[PDB]
């Protein structure tokens, strides 16, 4: 995309901590940038929309190349962050409102480095990543997500010279779902064969998808939470078409370059329904804030080893809370993501181990070694109504069959039109982000 001249781009300042030992950290003066999908797209030498509602203008965008020549994405000024997009920062806390009323629904954002010209790339192997979260106002159907993806640090600017904005304009998004709803891919409008998504007034799908590796630290609302590894072959940003995208709609979910299911550790799905929930007698009380700690263990305990284990623990009101465990007869009580856990649990659930097909923890680790961009988002789910996270999936499945039940939400929950009314004022908060060696962040 070209860059427009109507509004300066002003990312929100967000300090994080880089740590060397427990309680010995230094501030890193980073910032938050809005994903290019949420930006106004208009004519390069005017005010005329190139995209309105869920459609590209066919006169301006008869082809992707012409669209890209004629159109530009514009900046987010400071005033518009809260007023238009529902984003705000107080000290080291970042807040994202779900619906902001001209009416904005959801948000996806990235962490910029201290220069505000590149994404802050995190080399996560043999490191610990930690943050405080509040998901108390997110119920069934919503997801306040924090995760990493194998985006380029410059959003693709060096690879795709028609991308003028780079990381500064939140470009280059890709993930392990190979999404077609990304409006700008490889420096070009994804306007070919663009199709609105029914019941989604703001979104559509273009000819291409954009694939890359994804490490989900946090997919969650107050009812259920998960962390998940998604390797791809290769891991780096890859525009896809046809079978390579692994499109759900053509029966290709397991035929593409990315592991779409991922290998998940989701406490409720692993059959501990009392670990996490909205109340003081759950082990971890989702009505109150808490700290989420993630440790990425290698084979030799060094930065050069292969990724072998994703460990997790929590801190809430000064109380250390170890992760829940897998709880099925004849299955080891795993409390972390490893290749063995993935094989054993997917075996039990009858899920295809595409994680293993894509190179497993080792391949996931190669993405983490090269460095990944931090994503913070809030969203509802127009495909599957978040049932995969917090309900029975498939909805018609027996909840006593291992793998089906992922949370207590009813199978009628999560319809975007309903959650966008009922949960309009939901806000996820991510704060006090800390990064360092294992054992350094609490």
Numbering used by the authors: 20 to 120, 124 to 464
Manuscript text:
During macromolecular X-ray crystallography experiments, protein crystals held at 100 K have been widely reported to exhibit reproducible bond scission events at doses on the order of several MGy. OH-cleavage from tyrosine residues is regularly cited as amongst the most available damage pathways in protein crystals at 100 K, despite a lack of widespread reports of this phenomenon in protein crystal radiation damage studies. To better characterize the reproducibility of Tyr –OH group electron density loss in irradiated protein crystals, we have performed a systematic investigation on a wide range of structures at 100 K. A subset of previously conducted MX radiation damage investigations have included deposition of readily accessible coordinate and structure factor information in the Protein Data Bank (PDB), providing an ideal database of protein damage series.
Regardless of the feasibility of a radiation-induced Tyr –OH damage event within crystalline protein at 100 K, Tyr –OH density loss is in general significantly lower than for Glu and Asp carboxyl­ates for doses >1 MGy, at which de­carboxyl­ation events were reported. Prominent Tyr –OH density loss did not appear to be a widespread feature of general protein structures, a finding that is consistent with the high energetic barrier for Tyr phenolic C—O bond scission.
